[PDB]
Structures are given as C-alpha cells and as structure tokens.
Amino acid sequence: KFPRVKNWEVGSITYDTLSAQAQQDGPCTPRRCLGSLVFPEQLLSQARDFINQYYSSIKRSGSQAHEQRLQEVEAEVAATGTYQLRESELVFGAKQAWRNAPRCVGRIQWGKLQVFDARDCRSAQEMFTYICNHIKYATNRGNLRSAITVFPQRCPGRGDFRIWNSQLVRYAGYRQQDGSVRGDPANVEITELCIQHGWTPGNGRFDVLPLLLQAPDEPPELFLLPPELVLEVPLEHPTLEWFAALGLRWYALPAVSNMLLEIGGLEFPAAPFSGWYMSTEIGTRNLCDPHRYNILEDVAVCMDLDTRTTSSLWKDKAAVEINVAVLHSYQLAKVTIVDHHAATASFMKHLENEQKARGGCPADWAWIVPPISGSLTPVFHQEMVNYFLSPAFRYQPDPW
Amino acid sequence: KFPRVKNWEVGSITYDTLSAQAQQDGPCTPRRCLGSLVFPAPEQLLSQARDFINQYYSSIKRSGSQAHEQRLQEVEAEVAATGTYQLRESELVFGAKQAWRNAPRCVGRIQWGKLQVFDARDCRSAQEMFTYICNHIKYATNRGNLRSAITVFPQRCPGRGDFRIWNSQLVRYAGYRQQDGSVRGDPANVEITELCIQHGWTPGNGRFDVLPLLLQAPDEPPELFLLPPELVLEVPLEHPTLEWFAALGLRWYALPAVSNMLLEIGGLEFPAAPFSGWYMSTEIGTRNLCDPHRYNILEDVAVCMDLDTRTTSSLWKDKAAVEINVAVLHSYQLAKVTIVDHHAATASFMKHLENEQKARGGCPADWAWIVPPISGSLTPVFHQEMVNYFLSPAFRYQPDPW
Ligand code: HEM
Ligand code: HEM
Ligand SMILES: CNCCc1cc(F)c(F)c(-c2cc(C)cc(N)n2)c1
Ligand SMILES: CNCCc1cc(F)c(F)c(-c2cc(C)cc(N)n2)c1
Ligand SMILES: C[C@H](O)[C@H](O)[C@H]1CNc2nc(N)[nH]c(=O)c2N1
Ligand SMILES: C[C@H](O)[C@H](O)[C@H]1CNc2nc(N)[nH]c(=O)c2N1
Ligand SMILES: [Cl-]
Ligand SMILES: [Cl-]
Ligand SMILES: [Gd+3]
Ligand SMILES: [Gd+3]
Ligand SMILES: [Zn+2]
Numbered sequence: 001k002f003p004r005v006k007n008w009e010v011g012s013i014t015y016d017t018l019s020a021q022a023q024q025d026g027p028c029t030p031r032r033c034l035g036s037l038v039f040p041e042q043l044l045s046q047a048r049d050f051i052n053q054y055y056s057s058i059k060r061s062g063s064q065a066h067e068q069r070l071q072e073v074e075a076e077v078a079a080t081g082t083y084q085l086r087e088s089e090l091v092f093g094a095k096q097a098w099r100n101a102p103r104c105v106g107r108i109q110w111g112k113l114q115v116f117d118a119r120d121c122r123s124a125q126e127m128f129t130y131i132c133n134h135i136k137y138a139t140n141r142g143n144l145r146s147a148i149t150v151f152p153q154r155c156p157g158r159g160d161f162r163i164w165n166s167q168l169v170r171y172a173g174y175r176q177q178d179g180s181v182r183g184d185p186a187n188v189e190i191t192e193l194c195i196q197h198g199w200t201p202g203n204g205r206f207d208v209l210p211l212l213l214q215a216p217d218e219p220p221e222l223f224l225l226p227p228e229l230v231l232e233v234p235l236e237h238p239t240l241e242w243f244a245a246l247g248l249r250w251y252a253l254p255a256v257s258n259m260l261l262e263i264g265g266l267e268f269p270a271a272p273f274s275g276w277y278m279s280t281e282i283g284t285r286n287l288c289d290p291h292r293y294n295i296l297e298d299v300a301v302c303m304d305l306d307t308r309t310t311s312s313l314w315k316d317k318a319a320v321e322i323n324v325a326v327l328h329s330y331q332l333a334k335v336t337i338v339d340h341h342a343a344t345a346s347f348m349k350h351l352e353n354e355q356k357a358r359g360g361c362p363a364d365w366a367w368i369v370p371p372i373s374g375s376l377t378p379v380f381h382q383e384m385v386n387y388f389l390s391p392a393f394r395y396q397p398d399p400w
Numbered sequence: 401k402f403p404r405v406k407n408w409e410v411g412s413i414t415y416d417t418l419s420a421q422a423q424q425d426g427p428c429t430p431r432r433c434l435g436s437l438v439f440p441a442p443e444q445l446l447s448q449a450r451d452f453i454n455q456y457y458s459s460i461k462r463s464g465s466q467a468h469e470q471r472l473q474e475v476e477a478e479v480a481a482t483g484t485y486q487l488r489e490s491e492l493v494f495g496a497k498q499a500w501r502n503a504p505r506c507v508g509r510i511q512w513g514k515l516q517v518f519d520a521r522d523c524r525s526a527q528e529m530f531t532y533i534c535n536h537i538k539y540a541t542n543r544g545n546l547r548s549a550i551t552v553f554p555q556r557c558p559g560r561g562d563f564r565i566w567n568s569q570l571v572r573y574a575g576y577r578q579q580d581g582s583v584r585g586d587p588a589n590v591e592i593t594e595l596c597i598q599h600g601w602t603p604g605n606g607r608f609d610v611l612p613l614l615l616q617a618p619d620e621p622p623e624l625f626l627l628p629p630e631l632v633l634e635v636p637l638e639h640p641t642l643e644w645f646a647a648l649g650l651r652w653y654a655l656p657a658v659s660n661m662l663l664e665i666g667g668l669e670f671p672a673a674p675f676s677g678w679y680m681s682t683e684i685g686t687r688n689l690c691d692p693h694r695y696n697i698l699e700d701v702a703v704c705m706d707l708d709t710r711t712t713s714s715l716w717k718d719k720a721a722v723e724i725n726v727a728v729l730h731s732y733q734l735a736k737v738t739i740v741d742h743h744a745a746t747a748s749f750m751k752h753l754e755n756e757q758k759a760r761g762g763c764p765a766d767w768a769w770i771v772p773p774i775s776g777s778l779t780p781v782f783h784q785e786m787v788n789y790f791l792s793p794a795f796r797y798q799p800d801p802w
Contacts, residue, residue: 003427008693009693016432027430029429030429031422031425033426033788033789034403035788036435037406038408288778289409289777310744312726313722313726315743316775331713339715365436372777374771374774374776375686376698376717376718384436386436
C-alpha cells in the first residue's frame with residue numbers, strides 16, 4: 001500500500017508513507033497512466049484538517065491553543081459561512097502549498113518565503129501597488145528573494161480578485177499578417193487581451209506586457225509596470241562574441257500569477273508567487289521550444305554547425321551554448337539563477353529531508369527532470385510518487 | 401469519454417480510445433501516480449486466446465470468415481482437451497509484432513511491422529538454444545546492416561520447466577567487482593558476471609569482456625556458452641575531432657538484444673524470446689557511458705576536453721555528454737553499423753503515433769522512457785502528452801530464474 005521508491009543510481013529504497021494522506025484524486029487509474037498530461041459546510045472538514053496540520057507542525061497538537069483555534073473556526077463558519085486565517089496560518093499555508101507542489105524542483109527553499117498579506121486589498125489600484133511592492137522586494141536588485149502576495153480569498157456573492165496575466169512579467173507576442181508571431185508565442189492571447197483593453201502595443205520581440213488586474217465584479221484594469229521595476233538581463237555568451245548581437249533578453253523574476261492558492265478549504269484566486277529562474281527554463285524552454293522563441297537554428301547558423309544532418313547533434317550543441325549564455329549573462333548581471341545540475345542536486349537533498357520530515361514527497365518526474373541532459377542529473381534516476389496534498393497551488397480557469 | 405491528449409508544440413489534440421482496451425492494470429491509482437517507477441484457470445486463458453485470435457483475424461481483414469470461426473473453435477477445443485494450445489506460425493509472427501507494437505517504453509516502434517520472427521518452438525536443449533541464438537545474432541547483425549529479429553523458444557507448459565536465457569541481453573560486458581567496491585567493466589552486469597563465474601566461466605580482467613551466455617533448458621541447470629568473437633560485432637569509439645577520445649579504449653557492441661523478457665501472446669507465455677533491433681545512440685553515449693553507475697566516463701572526458709569541471713554552471717557535463725554521443729554516432733557510422741540518433745528516432749516515433757492514432761485510435765507510450773535522456777525538449781516527443789497502458793500481445797518483465 002505504501003509505494004516502494006527506488007533510486008537507480010545508488011540503489012537506495014524508501015517507502016512513501018505520505019501519499020496515503022493525498023486529498024484530491026489525480027488523473028491516473030490502474031488501467032492507464034496520465035502522468036504526462038499537463039492539465040488533468042464541507043469547508044469545516046478541510047479547515048479542521050488544516051488547523052490540525054498546523055498545530056501538529058508547531059508541536060502543539062491537543063493543546064488549549066489548538067482546541068481554542070478549532071472552536072474559533074467552527075464559530076466563524078457557523079456565523080459567516082467561511083473563516084479567516086490568522087497571519088501565522090496564512091504563512092504556514094503558503095509555505096506548505098509550495099512544499100506540496102509536485103512540479104517544483106526548487107522546493108529545497110520552501111521554508112524561506114516572504115508572505116505579503118494583501119487580504120485587506122480592495123480595488124485594482126491597490127492590487128497594483130501590492131504587486132509592485134512584491135516585484136521590488138523579490139527582485140532586490142538581482143539578489144532575488146522568494147515571495148508570495150496573497151490577495152483576498154474568494155467568498156460567496158462576490159467576484160474574485162484575479163491577475164489575468166499568467167506571470168507578472170511576460171513578453172508580448174504579436175500575431176503577424178501571415179500567421180507567424182513576433183515576440184513570445186505563448187503570450188498571444190494575453191497580448192491581444194491587453195490591446196483590446198486599451199494597451200498601445202509595441203512592435204518588438206521583448207516588449208514587457210502591462211498587467212490586467214481584476215478587482216471583484218469589475219472589468220480588468222490595465223497597469224503599466226514601471227520599466228525600472230522590471231529587471232531584465234541582456235543575453236551574451238562568454239566566448240561567442242556574436243551572441244550578444246542577437247539581442248536576446250530575459251527577465252529576472254519568474255512570478256506566476258494565475259494559480260489558485262488553497263489553504264484549509266479557503267481559496268485565493270490571486271496569490272502571485274515568485275522565486276528565481278532555473279536556467280533551463282530560459283535557455284532551453286523559453287528560447288529553444290519550437291512554439292516559443294524558437295531560436296535554436298538561428299544560433300546553430302551562427303555557430304557554423306552542420307545543420308544538414310541530425311546526427312551532428314547540432315541542436316544539442318546550440319542549446320547547450322544558449323544555456324551557457326543564460327547562466328553567464330545572469331551571473332554577469334548579478335541576477336540570481338541556478339543551473340539545472342545544482343537545482344536537481346538540491347532537490348535530491350530536499351527529497352531526503354522530506355522523507356525524514358514527512359515520510360515522502362509528492363514529485364512529478366516529467367517536470368522535475370530538466371529538459372536538457374535529463375540523465376546527467378540525479379533526479380532522472382530517482383523514482384518518484386505524484387499525489388496531491390493540501391495546502392496547494394492549483395490550476396484554475398482563465399477569468400474569461 | 402477517453403483520455404484527451406495534447407501535443408504542446410503544434411496544439412493538436414487527440415483522444416486515446418485504444419486505452420479503453422487496456423486489459424492488465426498498471427501501478428497508478430487516482431490517489432497517486434507511479435508512472436516513473438521502473439518495475440511496478442482455463443477460462444481466462446480462453447478469453448485471452450479468443451481476444452488474440454480475433455486480433456489476428458482483424459489484422460488480415462478476415463473477421464467472421466470460416467477460417468476465423470474454425471480457429472476460435474479449434475483453440476477452445478484444444479484448451480478443453482489439453483489445457484493449452486499452440487499458435488499457428490502466422491499467429492506467432494503477428495503476435496511478436498503486436499507485442500513490439502504494444503511496448504510502451506520502445507521509441508523505435510515505427511519499425512514494428514518489419515520483424516524477422518525465428519520460430520524456435522521445437523528447441524529441445526540448451527545446446528540448440530545456443531544454435532538458435534547464434535543464428536539470430538548472425539542474421540540480425542548482418543555485418544552491420546542490422547535487422548530487427550526475435551527468436552521464439554518453446555512456450556511455458558505445465559509439467560516442464562521453462563526455457564530461460566539468464567543474461568539480460570545476448571551481448572553484455574563483464575562487471576568485475578573489485579574488493580574496494582569499485583567495478584571494472586560494466587557495473588550493470590556484476591550479478592550475471594558472478595553467476596557466470598559461479599557456473600565455471602574463467603573471467604577476464606578488462607572493461608569490455610563479452611560475457612558468456614547462461615542458457616537454461618527445462619528442468620536443467622543453466623549451461624555456459626561462449627559466443628564466438630567473430631559473432632559479436634563491436635564498434636571502437638573515436639571522436640571525429642577529439643583525437644585523444646580513441647585512446648580511452650572505449651567500445652560498444654552492434655546488437656541490442658534483450659533476452660530476459662517474457663513474450664505473452666493469447667495467454668501463452670514464452671519466457672525465452674530474445675529480440676533485437678539497433679541502437680539509439682543515447683542508450684550508449686548517454687546512459688551506458690555517462691551514467692554514474694555505468695561506465696561513468698563523463699568527468700574524464702570533460703577534463704580531457706579541458707572543460708572547467710569545478711563549477712556546474714559552465715555546463716561541462718552537458719558539453720562532454722554531447723561529444724560522447726557524437727563519438728558514438730560517428731563511430732557507428734564509420735564502422736557501418738546501423739544506429740539512429742535521438743532526433744531521428746523521436747521524429748519517427750511521432751510519425752508512429754500519428755499512424756497508430758489512425759490505425760487503432762491511440763498508442764500506449766511511457767513518456768519517461770520515450771523522451772531521450774539528453775536534449776529532451778529538443779525532441780518532439782517531449783511536447784507530446786502520452787497515455788501509458790498495457791495491451792496484449794506484450795513483452796513483460798519476469799523474475800530472474802535464479
Ligand atoms: C526559489 C527558487 C525556485 C526555483 C529555482 C523554482 C523552480 C521551478 C521550476 C523549474 C518549475 C517548473 C516551471 C516550468 O517548467 O515552467 C517550478 C514550478 C513551480 N514552482 Fe517553483 N521554483 C522556485 C520557487 C518557487 C516558489 C517561491 C513557489 C511558491 C511559493 C514555487 C511554486 C511552484 C509551483 C506551484 C510550480 C508548479 C506550477 C505548475 O504546476 O504549473 N516555486 N519551479
Ligand atoms: C528497430 C530498432 C529499435 C530501436 C531504435 C529501439 C529503441 C528502443 C529504446 C531506445 C528503448 C529504451 C531502452 C533503454 O532505455 O534501456 C527500447 C525499449 C524496448 N524495445 Fe525497442 N527499439 C528497436 C527495436 C525493437 C524491437 C525489434 C523490439 C521487439 C521485437 C523492441 C522492443 C522493445 C521493448 C519491449 C522495450 C522495453 C523494454 C522494457 O520495458 O524494459 N524494440 N527500444
Ligand atoms: C503552468 N503553471 C506555471 C508553471 C511555471 C511557469 C513559468 F514560466 C515559471 F517561470 C514558473 C516558475 C515559478 C517560480 C516561482 C520559479 C521558477 N523558476 N519558475 C512556473
Ligand atoms: C528488460 N528491459 C530491457 C530494456 C532495454 C535495455 C537495453 F540495454 C536495450 F538496449 C534495449 C533495447 C532493445 C532493442 C530491441 C533496441 C534498442 N535500441 N534497445 C532495451
Ligand atoms: C507533454 C509534457 O508533459 C510536457 O511537454 C511537459 C513535460 N515536462 C515539463 N517539465 C517542466 N518542468 N515544465 C514543462 O512545461 C513540462 N512540459
Ligand atoms: C527512475 C526513472 O524511471 C529511471 O531512471 C528511468 C527513466 N527513463 C528511462 N528511459 C529509458 N529509455 N530507459 C531507462 O532506463 C529509463 N530509466
Ligand atoms: Cl518562464
Ligand atoms: Cl544498452
Ligand atoms: Gd561566418
Ligand atoms: Gd582536435
Ligand atoms: Zn500515473
């Protein structure tokens with residue numbers, strides 16, 4: 001019943017006892033595995049379970065404080081149909097949701113999270129102020145600091161706070177007259193949403209999009225990020241002197257803004273969180289994916305590689321140098337970045353910590369293994385168990 | 401409904417209706433996915449036999465024919481009289497091809513229709529096993545123009561032990577455990593090496609000593625057979641521009657021939673049915689040579705490339721691994737031994753997926769095994785959602801017979 005989990009490089013065996021606590025059901029069944037798919041008063045039970053989790057974590061289970069808190073949440077839900085987290089519980093909840101995220105290789109950091117409490121927020125203008133403060137704090141002039149800002153929870157009879165943008169920093173993607181894209185093809189939809197809401201578009205490949213911020217029951221409002229708040233890194237290569245001329249750039253801060261934060265049955269549809277980049281996200285996925293910037297063959301051309309035969313591994317050589325350029329450029333710019341070897345090594349340490357702390361760790365193998373040099377990293381050889389724990393970050397529908 | 405399956409590179413969406421035909425269960429439950437784990441009654445025989453006969457007669461466009469109905473009745477009668485039944489030669493060939501076609505962890509399945517099936521169900525001894533195995537190796541190797549082949553030894557039957565090939569592949573390099581814990585040779589083969597020594601093999605002392613075969617005839621201890629060196633085609637590894645790479649003395653063999661899996665067709669089990677194709681270069685260059693628990697050459701190659709190995713962010717591991725894969729591809733092409741790189745192989749697997757969507761409404765595929773171990777997202781299969789499930793005919797894992 002407890003899955004046996006093996007590391008094939010060392011031969012070590014663990015049993016994941018934590019998965020027995022999985023709440024939501026995942027997409028797999030005994031008949032077929034869908035692990036590779038990207039997208040697959042009951043409040044009182046989830047609330048009680050969360051309070052118990054928290055008071056267990058702080059070694060206060062069954063204490064007067066524990067029982068007092070349980071009675072308070074019961075009284076709130078009975079009186080109001082919902083309840084409010086204490087600040088300490090909010091901070092614990094956000095950290096746990098990160099800790100529980102199966103697709104995050106960066107969870108060695110999960111205990112170090114700045115939690116900005118924006119639950120008093122009203123109006124998109126206030127939202128923007130909170131978001132700018134978050135960006136400022138998290139960017140920290142390149143010495144990036146993981147942070148989350150939590151906007152008011154969902155409640156009956158009132159619309160949600162929503163950030164329409166998938167991230168706080170996104171590059172525009174402009175559909176061209178012939179169906180191609182200038183800029184980031186991942187952002188065509190949000191780009192034309194910004195334009196339809198009054199944004200004057202640019203004409204460039206790396207135009208930072210405005211933010212579309214939705215206060216409850218209002219249309220989204222456009223907010224322009226002050227340019228000095230959006231740290232970017234021009235990409236250069238340590239020995240390929242022509243790389244800099246390609247004018248490639250990426251931004252310092254990965255800040256996911258479209259996921260729902262769920263804590264104790266409470267739902268925060270706007271809770272943008274940020275850390276720092278793992279270099280393969282930029283150099284391999286964002287720049288080399290065929291449906292993203294797709295610059296691999298451009299770089300291969302500039303490297304004089306034999307692009308007439310796949311067996312020259314010209315694609316692999318070009319991608320590696322793009323990843324080198326990303327790492328070199330962020331380090332030169334003094335912007336926090338982690339390469340995929342360091343990140344996976346730390347994630348192995350995290351798995352070991354979590355085995356001792358909780359008896360296991362939900363982990364999505366396809367997402368944890370980096371998109372280049374998979375088996376050069378230790379996580380490739382590590383069997384993993386994927387399951388859903390709460391508190392959690394969840395996908396949610398786009399607010400349109 | 402059925403699983404909806406997206407390709408994220410193109411945006412195309414299909415539904416895997418074939419998954420609804422999955423007979424055996426995998427390891428996942430709604431509570432937790434175990435997809436990344438390597439190793440997760442005459443009436444059931446009749447249902448599996450009936451299903452397979454139906455598959456066969458569908459495949460040749462003969463469903464409902466007098467031949468179809470006659471075969472169903474013959475199998476039912478034979479099972480009732482004898483407890484088992486015997487495949488017709490054409491059904492064995494279809495079943496072997498289907499088992500390959502059904503193999504979720506095989507990226508080279510575009511080739512599934514081109515399989516030479518050697519019928520060794522008449523084999524009576526370990527000596528004759530070796531004769532069949534040597535003929536398989538000679539045929540499949542084809543002086544480097546490799547040909548996919550399977551040799552099917554007699555099925556499991558009550559009253560008699562199994563035919564078994566103890567070795568996991570027909571070609572394996574010895575792994576000699578050294579007293580300090582290290583391994584000379586291939587650390588993946590330490591156990592079969594010690595078994596070979598236990599059964600009277602005089603070991604070598606090199607890193608690329610081809611192991612003898614331990615062949616088990618029914619109810620018999622395994623018997624040791626040495627492969628004639630001229631039968632085992634090997635490729636010395638050199639690099640087109642790293643001239644010192646050749647001095648590493650690295651080699652690999654031409655023929656990937658898996659010999660420890662069980663072939664299951666229509667409820668019949670063939671515990672000895674070695675099959676072979678040709679290598680994808682990442683199996684050799686990335687896994688076999690660069691895995692820390694295999695030949696583990698990555699740092700020595702990176703140092704000889706004078707890369708800076710003191711920090712991970714120079715991506716020295718990545719650079720050395722690419723050049724080792726280059727060396728494998730170059731060396732196989734130079735030796736005129738069939739090999740496919742991971743770009744070509746994954747592109748052809750995408751064609752296979754498209755072919756199978758039209759032919760069967762889906763394709764069982766194990767994402768973690770299909771996506772190559774370097775340059776994953778540079779290949780189209782990384783962006784392809786996949787559904788993993790078990791169809792029969794099948795190649796299955798089985799316990800080691802010791
Ligand atoms: C501190 C450095 C961090 C690193 C290096 C890191 C690394 C990563 C990477 C590489 C991914 C996969 C992203 C992709 O492929 O698009 C990811 C996903 C994720 N990260 Fe982290 N992360 C960090 C911090 C954080 C923080 C602070 C949070 C939340 C408070 C977080 C929550 C998540 C979640 C929820 C996902 C999964 C999103 C999804 O399921 O689509 N991460 N992270
Ligand atoms: C024709 C050229 C072929 C190529 C390029 C190819 C490629 C591959 C590769 C790269 C793997 C993964 C192996 C590993 O990572 O250790 C694999 C697995 C597999 N192949 Fe193929 N293959 C070929 C032919 C065949 C043939 C002829 C058969 C059977 C008749 C076959 C059946 C299988 C099976 C059953 C597996 C999975 C074994 C397991 O689950 O452990 N393949 N193949
Ligand atoms: C589809 N769901 C969003 C997944 C996603 C997309 C993305 F583009 C990112 F950049 C990060 C991400 C987030 C954090 C906090 C750190 C980091 N390195 N990456 C996560
Ligand atoms: C029991 N699990 C076996 C998995 C495995 C291991 C291995 F070392 C291989 F080489 C192949 C393999 C097999 C074929 C026919 C072609 C090819 N390219 N690889 C398959
Ligand atoms: C189809 C497949 O699940 C998809 O391409 C996945 C693969 N693994 C991934 N892994 C990470 N970290 N991020 C991703 O976007 C993806 N995409
Ligand atoms: C733990 C993990 O499943 C293991 O390392 C897998 C990953 N994917 C693989 N993919 C292939 N093709 N071959 C393998 O041996 C493995 N090993
Ligand atoms: Cl990103
Ligand atoms: Cl191999
Ligand atoms: Gd020139
Ligand atoms: Gd030279
Ligand atoms: Zn699964």
